[PDB]
Amino acid sequence: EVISLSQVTPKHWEEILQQSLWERVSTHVIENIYLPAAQTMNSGTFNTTVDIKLKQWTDKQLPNKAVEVAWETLQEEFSRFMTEPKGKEHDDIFDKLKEAVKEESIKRHKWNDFAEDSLRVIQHNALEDRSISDKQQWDAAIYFMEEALQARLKDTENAIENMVGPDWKKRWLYWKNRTQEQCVHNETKNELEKMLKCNEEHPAYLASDEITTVRKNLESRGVEVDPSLIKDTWHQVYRRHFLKTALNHCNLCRRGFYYYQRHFVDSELECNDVVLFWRIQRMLAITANTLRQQLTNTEVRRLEKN
Amino acid sequence: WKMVRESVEQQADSFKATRFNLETEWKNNYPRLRELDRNELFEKAKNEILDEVISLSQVTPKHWEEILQQSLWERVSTHVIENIYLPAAQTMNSGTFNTTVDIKLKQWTDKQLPNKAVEVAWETLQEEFSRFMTEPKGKEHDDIFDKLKEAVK
Amino acid sequence: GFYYYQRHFVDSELECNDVVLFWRIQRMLAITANTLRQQLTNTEVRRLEKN
Amino acid sequence: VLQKDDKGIHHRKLKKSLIDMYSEVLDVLSDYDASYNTQDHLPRVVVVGDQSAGKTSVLEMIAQARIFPRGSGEMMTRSPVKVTLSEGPHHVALFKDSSREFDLTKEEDLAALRHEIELRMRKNVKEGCTVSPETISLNVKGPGLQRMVLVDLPGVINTVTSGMAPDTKETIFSISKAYMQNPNAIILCIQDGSVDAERSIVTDLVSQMDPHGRRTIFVLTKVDLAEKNVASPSRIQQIIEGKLFPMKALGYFAV
Amino acid sequence: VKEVLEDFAEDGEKKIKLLTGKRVQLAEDLKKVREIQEKLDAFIEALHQEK
Ligand SMILES: Nc1nc2c(ncn2[C@@H]2O[C@H](COP(=O)(O)OP(=O)(O)O)[C@@H](O)[C@H]2O)c(=O)[nH]1
Numbered sequence: 001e002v003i004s005l006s007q008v009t010p011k012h013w014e015e016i017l018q019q020s021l022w023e024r025v026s027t028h029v030i031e032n033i034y035l036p037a038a039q040t041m042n043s044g045t046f047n048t049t050v051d052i053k054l055k056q057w058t059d060k061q062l063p064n065k066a067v068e069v070a071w072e073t074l075q076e077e078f079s080r081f082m083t084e085p086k087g088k089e090h091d092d093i094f095d096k097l098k099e100a101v102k103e104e105s106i107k108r109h110k111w112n113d114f115a116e117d118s119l120r121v122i123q124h125n126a127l128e129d130r131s132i133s134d135k136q137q138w139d140a141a142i143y144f145m146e147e148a149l150q151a152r153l154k155d156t157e158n159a160i161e162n163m164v165g166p167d168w169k170k171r172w173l174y175w176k177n178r179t180q181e182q183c184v185h186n187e188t189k190n191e192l193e194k195m196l197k198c199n200e201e202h203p204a205y206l207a208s209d210e211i212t213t214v215r216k217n218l219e220s221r222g223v224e225v226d227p228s229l230i231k232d233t234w235h236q237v238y239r240r241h242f243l244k245t246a247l248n249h250c251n252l253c254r255r256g257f258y259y260y261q262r263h264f265v266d267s268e269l270e271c272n273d274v275v276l277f278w279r280i281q282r283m284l285a286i287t288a289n290t291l292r293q294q295l296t297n298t299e300v301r302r303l304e305k306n
Numbered sequence: 307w308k309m310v311r312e313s314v315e316q317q318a319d320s321f322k323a324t325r326f327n328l329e330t331e332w333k334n335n336y337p338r339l340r341e342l343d344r345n346e347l348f349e350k351a352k353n354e355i356l357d358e359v360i361s362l363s364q365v366t367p368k369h370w371e372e373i374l375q376q377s378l379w380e381r382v383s384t385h386v387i388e389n390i391y392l393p394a395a396q397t398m399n400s401g402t403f404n405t406t407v408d409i410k411l412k413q414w415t416d417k418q419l420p421n422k423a424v425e426v427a428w429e430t431l432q433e434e435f436s437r438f439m440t441e442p443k444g445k446e447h448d449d450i451f452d453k454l455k456e457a458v459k
Numbered sequence: 460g461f462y463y464y465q466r467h468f469v470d471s472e473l474e475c476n477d478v479v480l481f482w483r484i485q486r487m488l489a490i491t492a493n494t495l496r497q498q499l500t501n502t503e504v505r506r507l508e509k510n
Numbered sequence: 511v512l513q514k515d516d517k518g519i520h521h522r523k524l525k526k527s528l529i530d531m532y533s534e535v536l537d538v539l540s541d542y543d544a545s546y547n548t549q550d551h552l553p554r555v556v557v558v559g560d561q562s563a564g565k566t567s568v569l570e571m572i573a574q575a576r577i578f579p580r581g582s583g584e585m586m587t588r589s590p591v592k593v594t595l596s597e598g599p600h601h602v603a604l605f606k607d608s609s610r611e612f613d614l615t616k617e618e619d620l621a622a623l624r625h626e627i628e629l630r631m632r633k634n635v636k637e638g639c640t641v642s643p644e645t646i647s648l649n650v651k652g653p654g655l656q657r658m659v660l661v662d663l664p665g666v667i668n669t670v671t672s673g674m675a676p677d678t679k680e681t682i683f684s685i686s687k688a689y690m691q692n693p694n695a696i697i698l699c700i701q702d703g704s705v706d707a708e709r710s711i712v713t714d715l716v717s718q719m720d721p722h723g724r725r726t727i728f729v730l731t732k733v734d735l736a737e738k739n740v741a742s743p744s745r746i747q748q749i750i751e752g753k754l755f756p757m758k759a760l761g762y763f764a765v
Numbered sequence: 766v767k768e769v770l771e772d773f774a775e776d777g778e779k780k781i782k783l784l785t786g787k788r789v790q791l792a793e794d795l796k797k798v799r800e801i802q803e804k805l806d807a808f809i810e811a812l813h814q815e816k
């Protein structure tokens with residue numbers, strides 16, 4: 001079976017390693033790199049800000065998480081090859097030894113200690129080369145970026161619905177009502193939504209005067225709100241506002257450029273987020289290949305030897 | 307000394323012109339700018355850093371626990387689904403399903419889960435700390451403190 | 460077309476690079492001319508007047 | 511009151527109140543302004559010339575103490591060395607920021623001054639070259655001294671040999687022009703007297719920076735070679751009279 | 766954080782490099798010009814006292 005594990009095609013390793021690793025770091029870039037960089041209208045600063053973070057992030061975290069994913073990814077398939085039943089036919093009599101052998105073999109499975117150094121150079125070069133001259137590169141990058149953003153949007157929206165509770169559609173359909181906190185959140189949300197309704201470009205940071213303004217606007221309706229409630233409400237609603245804007249930006253990025261006569265119209269649609277996303281997708285894809293090469297050249301043999 | 311007495315005095319004209327130009331740039335752009343030398347800017351950045359770190363230290367437990375649960379779930383959801391739930395699902399005996407699930411969960415707890423939990427806590431603390439330390443997501447921020455804030459972070 | 464809009468998510472037939480080059484040339488020439496004018500009016504013109 | 515007396519007129523207003531304070535003005539301006547574009551009003555006693563041995567000797571003729579690096583077959587003066595001169599208790603000296611007082615009548619302290627100067631020169635000059643503009647500062651007092659501030663600058667080469675970095679001549683000229691381009695500076699050109707007047711390396715520079723003869727004074731080293739006829743006596747007489755200078759000159763003195 | 770802030774306070778070089786905001790440098794230039802102006806005023810007053 002472990003030899004059969006050594007027969008797994010690179011196609012599976014590269015796809016599994018790339019998909020698993022990105023999902024692990026998909027939110028770090030969005031939350032800690034992209035979104036704060038999106039707070040400025042200076043695209044140069046936006047790209048400058050992220051590149052500095054990425055290189056520092058790259059040196060310290062990316063190759064360490066990448067190897068861990070590869071180390072686990074190999075063990076995940078190994079366990080499936082090792083002890084997974086052949087459908088309804090399985091010799092469970094051997095499972096004790098199989099897992100016992102695995103534990104000793106994984107303890108002796110010491111991943112190459114210099115794999116990270118190669119990845120750092122690779123990742124620096126993958127990030128350093130930001131030239132996307134190919135439409136297909138653009139097309140792939142934007143659709144996958146949308147999925148990550150749509151995931152965040154639903155994650156925020158699901159948190160919001162709990163924060164605010166069901167709407168009248170479900171309150172009357174399922175005979176439900178709001179908690180007093182949800183009632184506060186709905187009105188706190190409404191005031192923030194009205195503020196964004198006009199100030200669509202409002203920065204994510206709120207001034208205490210806005211906090212006071214919301215409170216008095218809510219107190220004027222009999223609703224007294226602690227500032228902390230507003231800030232917690234603000235963060236989720238802002239992302240929903242921002243994320244919908246980003247997806248609409250993405251929609252025009254693909255559609256607007258897609259129309260041929262619009263390519264000579266220099267509108268403010270610098271889809272620099274697709275540049276960031278694309279490089280990471282390529283960067284991780286190369287990372288997965290380097291891991292796969294190490295996986296199949298050195299690490300699986302060590303697993304077999306152990 | 308004759309050249310001294312003849313020429314040194316007029317060096318005041320250029321000194322005054324330089325002071326005037328610097329103060330003019332300040333009045334036009336930096337009316338709050340003072341002798342903000344190596345000491346004053348450092349002190350202001352230090353005080354802002356300490357205040358923001360204290361504010362972080364005062365963050366409510368509710369936010370902490372919510373973000374920690376969300377992050378750890380993001381990290382472990384697919385591990386659970388792919389390595390425990392789905393493989394266990396192959397059996398029609400829910401009792402052996404539950405037995406295998408519990409054994410795998412115990413092993414994962416012993417070896418991986420608390421390390422991922424500590425990673426989540428540490429990185430979440432880093433994220434909130436950076437949010438306080440880094441540029442606030444507004445327009446009023448003065449970047450002049452960013453060098454010290456980031457270096458200290 | 461344009462530098463950015465010709466590339467992203469479009470089937471452009473253009474691939475224009477000369478515009479960037481000569482635009483940078485224009486900017487470098489303008490900056491050089493302004494630096495030269497400043498040097499002239501600060502030092503060189505009054506040097507010639509003194510001569 | 512003690513600061514008012516010590517930092518102002520401690521019974522010596524001309525020599526003390528504003529001679530060391532002039533050096534402080536120069537030091538603070540050089541600290542603020544690395545360039546000399548703002549030092550035009552501040553005169554200095556500037557010694558320039560070739561690698562002539564008498565460059566050290568003239569500076570010890572004005573700073574009447576054997577306090578300057580002495581050597582043969584080499585240009586010892588790597589970097590500018592500032593000396594503040596004034597009257598005071600006989601043969602006493604100070605070295606800036608060394609927290610040490612020096613007795614100029616004993617060989618140990620003069621050697622200590624020269625070695626500290628050499629070490630500061632060796633720290634000012636980086637590998638591959640012999641000169642550096644970075645300054646070294648002294649405060650020397652004695653009855654034989656005038657209220658003067660002197661700077662000991664590297665000799666001009668105009669050519670680079672012996673594996674030395676080719677930038678050395680341009681670095682030397684920049685170091686020396688930092689002062690020779692000072693409208694109020696006093697330039698002392700040190701001329702090696704072992705050669706005929708036709709060989710003068712620094713004449714062409716002062717003839718452009720001081721064509722009016724308002725700063726530049728030429729001094730002839732090794733005057734004993736005029737007695738021996740090793741150097742042409744006729745050209746020596748003409749340089750004394752000044753017939754050989756393609757420029758106006760402030761004066762001429764024998765070393 | 767407090768220890769790091771103390772270390773930066775003690776570390777002159779790190780403060781020098783971190784504090785290059787171009788306004789710190791303008792303030793330093795203004796202060797140094799003022800100091801040289803005071804030294805020059807005292808020096809010139811002494812010169813006039815010498816006449
Ligand atoms: N014969 C002769 N020897 C001199 C004269 N001036 C200096 N020397 C000697 O040469 C040395 C010159 O000192 P040096 O370090 O070369 O001066 P620097 O090259 O300008 O730094 C002194 O120690 C003297 O012994 C001079 O006019 N005639």
Ligand code: ALF
Nearest residue numbers: 561585586587665
């Ligand atoms: F020999 Al020199 F300056 F050191 F002329």
Ligand SMILES: [K+]
Nearest residue numbers: 561562563584
């Ligand atoms: K010499």
Ligand SMILES: [Mg+2]
Nearest residue numbers: 565566586587
């Ligand atoms: Mg010398």
